[PDB]
Design a protein around this ligand. Structure first.
Ligand SMILES: Cc1cc2nc3c(=O)[nH]c(=O)nc-3n(C[C@H](O)[C@H](O)[C@H](O)COP(=O)(O)OP(=O)(O)OC[C@H]3O[C@@H](n4cnc5c(N)ncnc54)[C@H](O)[C@@H]3O)c2cc1C
Ligand SMILES: NC(=O)c1ccc[n+]([C@@H]2O[C@H](COP(=O)([O-])OP(=O)(O)OC[C@H]3O[C@@H](n4cnc5c(N)ncnc54)[C@H](OP(=O)(O)O)[C@@H]3O)[C@@H](O)[C@H]2O)c1
Length: 612
């Protein structure tokens, strides 16, 4: 009887683990799926308007992107592609017997609160039914409703216009003049793949982002431990790793002119994973314009900054991402941003969960983050967990990023899945220094798995092949300082911490780290008059590419005092070309030898074409 009856919207990864989690706490799942098969966005249809495209592979290694008690098969590789992922989801649904609860061809239409119960409107027309449930797990994913920007004249463009959700492979670009717009992962992969077939590829973007390949050195991009992520200096570490472990890539990244500015990295600190677009841009295979499109003529495109007119455009691919606001129509009455504590639990009745939350999950795979929410909701349903009033207070904000490995620590602690810092601090610390290995979270607490330890052991043996120990030990001292003086004294007494550790924490007091919810969040931060603007812009670009401050850059100082390099000089002139479409011939710097000599030349060349 007490089997609670939970309505799960979706058969994708979230719905699968959401159902398997409630089955561990003896509840009864009811999955409704609009499509005819499980798998989610990893399912292709023929008139494709959403869903992963052919070359898609996971950005992060299998060691951090799959479920706690169900390892992925890496025979064909550590970065799983479309076939293996949907394979995985089907294997999971079968070991934990999830198929029986799935009702395919069944679209949820409305969810309304009904006392403490929930009334759900299922199915479309003559199959329209209505059932009642104890809780609703919203597991409908993202990336389904394209977002089309409003651009002047695009509605009258006479070429083909696609949105990336329709993309499957690059045979569609063969022989064509392509304009790719947007520089998320989709724009990156499409632009890169287009550059191996198309007649010409033009890549439009407004602002530069950080790109890493899948492997950084001889380890996956995602092998980074919470301790490192806590020294903060967000990605100063990852950048160091790149610079020290991937020097060739780092020089090539610079020469592309696509390495972003500090102001750029603070504005979006999210690390995008792509393998290849930067090499293609370096080689001239792609023509990047970092600026804003002014308007679209009938078969071409005009740019605001440079005045560039690209002509005879065959295809525009709008890689402009998704409006995920409409994926929440069946709960139109609710404001997800304002009613969901942590963007995850309906504040007045958590029986209503939003598994994906509302933020951007970086650093490791999405699956184990979803799983963690699933294990947590399973306990809220059992009555074994009652969100406290600081929990209910949190609001997921627009733009925010979630450093998953931290989110799993924060949540893994609430559920008692990690050694207690107050009693097993040394162990807690080892955990904070391993990458996000999901088997770590099934060694203790609710529903462990005996085979977990051995799984976690292979992943950690691959981790062990940089330190900043000093900084790390300072994170140790500051964590400990953050536990308080009573717990510190107790750890000292019981022999968990040495006398040095204890005394240092005693000194690192006003710098104490207290792990909390927002530990896991990152918030991004953002004629004559014309000719002054040009030279001002050129100096900044020289400042960016040189790592020098505009004070030290002066009009009449010879440019060669400034210590350029082949790499930094290239980077400096591709950046010029990207914003003003001016090409610097191979003698530009032998003939113009000061800043003022260079800007006056380029501004002339600029205005001999269309300016402003
Ligand atoms: C191109 C691309 C690449 C990606 N790469 C990665 C990656 O490398 N790593 C990673 O971790 N993640 C990646 N993701 C995203 C992430 O993997 C997916 O969101 C993941 O599958 C989790 O999906 P989900 O469980 O939230 O539901 P989804 O997989 O989004 O599917 C949701 C399901 O709910 C169903 N549904 C929706 N509305 C209703 C309704 N009203 N009634 C009934 N059913 C409904 C849908 O039919 C769908 O089957 C990528 C996404 C895209 C588009
Ligand atoms: N952990 C994971 O591995 C994981 C999980 C989920 C999803 N993903 C990735 O998320 C991707 C889905 O999002 P997406 O990358 O397609 O889109 P996106 O990240 O939302 O970015 C859309 C792009 O379009 C540009 N754009 C938007 N509006 C524009 C306008 N009016 N004019 C010009 N440019 C505009 C944006 O640049 P601006 O900066 O100028 O806006 C942006 O680069 C998937 O491909 C997947 O790889 C990864």
């Amino acid at each position: 009887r007490t089997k609670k009856r939970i309505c799960i919207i979706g058969a994708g990864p979230a719905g699968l683990v959401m159902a398997k989690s409630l089955l561990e706490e003896g509840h009864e799942p009811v999955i409704y799926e609009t499509e005819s098969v499980l798998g989610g966005i990893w399912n292709i249809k023929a008139d494709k308007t959403a869903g992963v495209y052919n070359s898609t592979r996971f950005q992060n290694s299998a060691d951090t992107s799959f479920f706690s008690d169900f390892p992925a098969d890496t025979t064909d590789g550590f970065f799983l592609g479309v076939d293996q992922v949907r394979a995985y989801l089907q294997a999971y649904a079968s070991r934990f017997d999830i198929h029986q609860y799935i009702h395919y061809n069944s679209k949820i239409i409305a969810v309304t609160e009904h006392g403490d119960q929930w009334k759900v409107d299922i199915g479309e027309g003559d199959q329209q039914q209505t059932r009642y449930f104890d809780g609703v797990a919203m597991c409908h994913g993202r990336y389904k409703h394209p977002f089309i920007p409003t651009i002047p004249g695009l509605d009258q463009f006479q070429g083909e216009v696609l949105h990336s959700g329709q993309y499957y492979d690059n045979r569609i670009f063969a022989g064509k003049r392509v304009l790719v717009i947007g520089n998320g992962v989709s724009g990156m992969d499409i632009a890169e793949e287009a550059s191996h077939v198309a007649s010409a590829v033009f890549w439009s973007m407004r602002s530069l982002r950080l790109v890493l390949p899948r492997m950084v050195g001889y380890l996956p991009n995602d092998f980074i431990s919470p301790a490192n992520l806590l020294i903060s200096k967000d990605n100063s570490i990852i950048m160091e790793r790149l610079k020290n472990s991937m020097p060739e890539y780092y020089e090539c990244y610079q020469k592309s002119g696509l390495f972003p500015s500090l102001e750029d990295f603070r504005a979006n600190p999210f690390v995008h994973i792509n393998d290849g677009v930067i090499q293609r841009v370096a080689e001239g295979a792609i023509q990047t314009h970092v600026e804003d499109i002014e308007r679209f003529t009938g078969r071409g495109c005009i740019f605001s900054a440079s005045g560039t007119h690209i002509e005879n455009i065959d295809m525009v691919v709008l890689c402009t991402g998704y409006d995920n606001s409409q994926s929440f129509d069946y709960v139109k009455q609710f404001s997800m941003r304002d009613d969901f504590a942590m963007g995850l639990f309906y504040r007045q009745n958590p029986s209503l969960v939003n598994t994906y939350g509302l933020q951007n999950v970086g650093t490791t795979g999405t699956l184990p983050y979803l799983e963690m929410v699933a294990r947590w909701y399973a306990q809220i349903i059992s009555g074994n967990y009652t969100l406290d009033a600081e929990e209910l207070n949190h609001r997921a904000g627009e733009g925010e990023i979630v450093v998953a490995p931290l989110a799993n620590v924060i949540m893994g602690l609430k559920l008692g899945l990690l050694p207690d810092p107050k009693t097993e601090f040394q162990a807690f610390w080892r955990c904070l220094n391993y990458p996000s290995f999901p088997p770590m979270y099934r060694l203790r607490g609710p529903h462990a798995d005996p085979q977990a330890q051995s799984v976690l052991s292979r992943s950690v043996q691959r981790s062990l092949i940089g330190e900043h120990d000093s900084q790390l030990q300072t994170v140790k001292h500051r964590l400990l300082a953050g536990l308080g003086e009573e717990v510190m004294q107790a750890l000292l007494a019981r022999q968990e911490i040495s006398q040095e550790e204890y005394l240092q924490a005693q000194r690192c007091g006003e710098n104490a780290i207290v792990l909390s919810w927002d530990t896991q969040v990152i918030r991004p931060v953002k004629d004559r008059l014309a000719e002054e603007a040009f030279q001002q812009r050129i100096t900044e670009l020289m400042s960016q590419t040189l790592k020098l401050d505009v004070g030290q850059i002066t009009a009449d100082r010879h440019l060669s005092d400034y210590g350029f390099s082949s790499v930094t000089l290239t980077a400096f002139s591709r950046k010029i070309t990207d914003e003003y479409n001016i090409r610097l011939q191979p003698f530009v710097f032998l003939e113009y030898t000061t800043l003022k000599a260079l800007t006056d030349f380029l501004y002339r060349k600029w205005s001999e074409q269309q300016p402003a």
